Each structure stands twice: as structure tokens, then as C-alpha cells.
Amino acid sequence: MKEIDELTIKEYGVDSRILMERAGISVVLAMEEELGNLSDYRFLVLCGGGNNGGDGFVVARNLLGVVKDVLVVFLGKKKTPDCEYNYGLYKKFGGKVVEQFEPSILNEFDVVVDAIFGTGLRGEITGEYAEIINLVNKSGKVVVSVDVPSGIDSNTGKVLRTAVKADLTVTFGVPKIGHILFPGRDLTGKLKVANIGHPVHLINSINRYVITREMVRSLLPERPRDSHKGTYGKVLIIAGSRLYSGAPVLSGMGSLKVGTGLVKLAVPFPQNLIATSRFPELISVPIDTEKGFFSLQNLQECLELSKDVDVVAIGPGLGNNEHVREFVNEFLKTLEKPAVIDADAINVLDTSVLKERKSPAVLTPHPGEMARLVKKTVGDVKYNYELAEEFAKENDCVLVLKSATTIVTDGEKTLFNITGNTGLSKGGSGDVLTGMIAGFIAQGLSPLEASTVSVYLHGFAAELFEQDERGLTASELLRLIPEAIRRLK
């Protein structure tokens, strides 16, 4: 993006001042759309010395004579040339600037425009910058951030000591990673993305995307009228144990609710009987085990079962002990079908197996599972899209790293999912998503496409729950999937 500004100025010939004018007026229009008529509000515009501040001077200048009061607090030392030009315009237009900030200054204003730092933030915020941000955060005023809330690193979404909490953020061209990943996603408040005149070619060249409704709509598989269940594929789910009898049921129904033609579960006897007593549409094959867990004794039956399917999901509720490790790794090594690898199958996975497989795989860890898989801490892997990309690329797989914002990558293309709510922060949620992904693969979507559509729909179904999200359970999530699908179309 600063690349995209650079090219638009130096190669396309757009004056930097024209980009900055367009940025500032976008902020004014955005605020009007959110607050209604601006003429009754008093504005405090906080401007740094850089281009974000310059954008702020444009805002301030365009509000002059049209709103109740505007004051700029200039917080920088030096001014970049465009900031200086726009400062000069603000003052020529009769605008007032002060350079000292007084704690009681918030009292006489209704709206704070935060133009302190944009994408040029380097290092922790301290001093008067911090004191001022902390005062704005305690003020209860309406806060509109220019580009990114000051204090958010726009590459990672991390807070650099302290950051503005905005009601509205207006960003330019494309959303930044810092609006998409937490905590930055939370501090952004409502995000508007403004067109400030970059060539469309440069906007579309970005390689990291937010999954949108239109993207998912266009990926949904067709349902030709002259069809039968075989048209819509077959899934095998290898799942469950004497300890975890529920997981298979949720995965299997996740596949059926997204349109899959046939779903077979392989589950240890008698736990397999649990699935059909709840959903008799499922096929739940009884696997005879020594002690209630899959082991190498079951390798051959599972491979036979896999021959008549298009995709295999493995892992939910398997347990994690040595015989399961041996089974999972020997199975995946021999299986010549796409695999969706989740939960306990991740916890015992030998990643060498993934390198040697000719067939594709999708892995769906939460950060605790990812952390154990790459031998790092949760803090080092959480929202670490570059680590996810490296892992996907090295192991020839799709990685779906689950969290409130989910990252979906094959190492070349990375997508971010922002649907969902905290009702998914509960056992069983993950098991449903596993079945969904397998189901869409069976219907003919690529592993990456299936993962993209599934994470979106899974989160969207959650948002459709009619009561308080904390009461959402996986069973109700399932009931909501076909409504998410209908609403998407």
C-alpha cells in the first residue's frame, strides 16, 4: 500500500497532494454517513507531523465554516512536505492550531479525529503521545481514526504500548492487516474503505484478502437438477473413541448440512451407535477396537472404507496416545485421497508424512495445536500469518489457523475470515467446521476453496443464532448452516 501510493505518484503521475485531498474528504464523507449532519458538532483534530497528520489537516480545513468548531492540536515536531502544505492551507483558511494539549481540552469538543500515526508508526508509543491517547480513550467522545487507529501496527494488529480505540476508522484503498487481526480489529471499530484514486489494477494486486460474501457466493458449487447423491460426493470421517463419542456426529452432520451426498463415519463400537440415534441419515460403521481407541489393528479396514469415498476427515475425538499416533501416521501415509486433518490427528501428526503424501491435505488447528505442531509458544503462532504461510508452503497443504479471525492459506494465497462470534468459543464448533470443509471438497471445490467457503459460512451461521450468542451450541450451529447458505445467495 505505501508501495501503492508510491507507484500511483511516481509511475502513474498522480500528485501526492491530490491523494492526500481525496483521503481527507473521504474521512469527512464517512463521518457524515455515520453521524448525520456535521453542522452541530465540535471537532478536535489531533495531527502528527507525517502524512496521517496531513490527512488530518485536510479534514480540519474541509470542516471550517461548516461545523460548530474545529481545533487542531499539532503533536509532531517537523512536518513532511504534504503535511506542511495542508497545514498552510488550514491556516490560510482561518483555522486554529495549538501545539500544547491540555487534559481539559476534550471537554469542549464532541468528536476527536485521530490523525496522529498511520502506517508510519515505528516502535512503542510514549511521552505526550501516550498521555494524549490515554486521555482520548477515557473521554467518552466519538473517535474517528484516519487510516488506522494510532498505536496499532498495521502489519500485525498488535498494540504498540498504547492505541486509540476508535468508533470509526476510515482507511484508504484496501483494509490493512491491522484492521483484520486482533487486538487491532477491536480498536478499529467500524471500518470504511475509501477509494482515494489508486488505479484499480494496483488495488487488485494485493495477495492477502478478507473473505467476502461475494467471494463465497461465487465459489458455492452448482446444484444441477438432474443429479443424485453421487453428484455431491462421499466423505469418510474417522473419529471418536470411548472417551469422545460426540465428535463424529458433529463432523458428519457438518458435511451433510453443506450439501454432501453421502457421509460415512468410522467410530469405535459401541460409540458408533450414538451417531445414528441422533441423526439416522448418517452411516456410522462400528470399528472393533481393543480398548476403545483406533490402533494399527484398524488400519486395513479404514483404508478399505476410504476406497469408495472422495475425501477423508480424521481426528475429532480420536484421543492422543501411542497407538492412535501409529495409526494416524500410517493411515495418512498410505491414503491416496484428500485428507482433512483436525484435532487429535494434528496432535499426533508426523509432519514428514505430509511432505511425502501425493494427495492434498487441509490442516485445521487452533493456536494451541499449531503451537505443539511447530514446537513454538501459542503467543508466537497466534495470528502469525507469515508462519502459517511458511508452514503451508513447506508441507504442501492448506492451513486453516482458527481464531476469532481465521487465517486460511496455501502458502501463496492468504485469506482472512471475519464472520462468527463468541458462541463458537465452545467445544464442538471445530468438529462441525471439519465436516463442512470435507463436504465441500467432496462436492468438487479445491482444498483452499473448500476451506474459504467453510470458515465464512461457519461463522455466518453463528451470527444467525436468534438468542444470546453465549448460548449457542454446535447442535444449533448445524441447524443454522442451511439458512447461512440461503442468505448467501
Partner: peptide
Amino acid sequence: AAWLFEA
């Protein structure tokens, strides 16, 4: 109408 703003 979406010339100016995407959300």
C-alpha cells in the same frame, strides 16, 4: 452504490 466506500 459503492464508488467511494467498501465495508
